[PDB]
Amino acid sequence: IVGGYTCQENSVPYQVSLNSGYHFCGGSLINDQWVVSAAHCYKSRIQVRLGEHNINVLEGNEQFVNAAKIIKHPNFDRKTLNNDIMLIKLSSPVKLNARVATVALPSSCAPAGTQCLISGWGNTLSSGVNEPDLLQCLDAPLLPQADCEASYPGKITDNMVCVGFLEGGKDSCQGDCGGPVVCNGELQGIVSWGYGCALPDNPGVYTKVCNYVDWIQDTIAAN
Template sequence: MLFYGALIISLVSFSEAKIRPNNEIKVINGNDAQKGQFPWQVELMLETTDNNRIFCSGAIISHVWVLTSASCIQNANSISVSYGSNNSSDATTIESKSHIIYKNFNNDTLQNDIGLVELKSHIIFDETTQAISLSEDVVGDGVNVTIAGWGHSKNDSDKNNNRTEILQYVNISTIKNSECAEVFGRDVVTSTVLCTHNSSLVQGPCINDGGAPLIMNAATDPQHVGIFSFMGENGCEKNYPAAYTRTASYLDWIKNNTDV
C-alpha cells in the first residue's frame, strides 16, 4: 500500500514509532484477491504539483465519487482512477474532475485524513465494480476487518515499480485506541482514528496503500469503516499498528459533499 514523499513526524518519547503517512505505503503477508472480490477497490495514480507520480488506493462510494485519504491527494495536480479488476494491468481508467480535502486536515498529526475524488464520467456497475456502503457504527476493538491494496508486499523500496500487480488482502483485528496511542501518542490516536494490529504475525498495509478502505464483513455485508492513514516510519515489517481514519466520524461531511 502507499506511502509517498516521506512525510515523517517526530513524536517525542515515541522513538521508533514515528508516523509514516499512507500515500507511501502494500499489504504485508497478504492473499491474492479473486476477480470481483473487492468490487469497490480502486487504484489512484496522481501527478503532483511538483511533477512526481504517486500511487494510492480508494473506494467507490457512488457512480462518480471515490473516498480516499487527504494525505494521498493533497498535492495532486491530476488524478487517474483505475477500477474493475483485481489485476492493475487489466483495469479500466477514468480521469478525475475535481478533488476535495477535509478543511481541517492536519498534515503534521494526520488528523482528519480524509478526501474525496469526483470523476469526470459515471462508472457503470457490474459484477466487478460496485459502490461500498459506509458504516454508521463506531467500530470497537477486537473486530475482524479486511484491508486490501496494490502496494508493496515487503518493505523493500519506496519505488512505485515495486507495487504488486494483483490486489492483495489480509484479515486482521482492530485494537484499543489506548494500545495504539502507546505507540503513536494520544495527540495522534484520537477518537476519529482506528487501529489494527496482529501481534503474532506481520500483516497489514505497506508502501503505496494509502487511502485504502478498511472493510467490516467483507464477504457478507461489506461496510466501509476506515481509510488507511499511516504506519510507523521504520517500515511495514516492524509490526507496528496501522492507523485509519474512522468513516463514521465523517459521514455528514461525505454526504454534504457528494451524492451519497
C-alpha cells in the same frame, strides 16, 4: 499489503487504484460518481482505475475515469495526518456491475475485535519495496483504542483507529494509502500511516470513517 494474500480477481469491487502515470494510492467507490480516499493522496490530476486485478495487464474489466473534483477534508493536517480523508468526484459516472461496485458507509463506529478486510497494491515488504501487480488482501481486526495509543504515544486522535496485529508480519504499507478497511460490509477505515510496515508493536493507523459520514454526505450534496 505486507503478509497478505492475492485477492480473488475482482472480489473487492469497490477497490480502485489512483494513477498519475503509475499506481500511487487506493480508494473506495461509494456511489457511481464518487470515491473516498486519504487526503495524503491528493494530487492536481488523478485518473481513477476501477475493475482492476492486475494493474499492469488489461484483463478486460477495467474502467478508467478522470477525477473532476478532488476535495481534501478542510481540517486535514499534513503533519499529524488528523482528518486524513478526501473525496474524488469522477468526470462521469461509472458502469456498475459485479466487478465495479459500491461499498456502504458505516452506520455506527465498529467495536474493537471486529474482523475486517484491508486491500491494495501498496508495498508488500517490511524492509525495502516490492510493488505487486495483483491486488493483495489482508484479514485483520480493529484493535482497542488503548493499544493504539500506547503504540504511538501522543499521536492518535479520535479520528484514527489501529487495525492489524501487535506481533507484526501483516499490515498495510505505502501505496495502500487511501484504500479500504471494510468490516461486515461497511467502510470503517482508510489506510493512513504507521511507523514502518508490519513491525511488531507498530500496527497500521487508519482514518476512522464513522466520524465523517456527515461531511461525506454533505460534500457530495454540495458538489
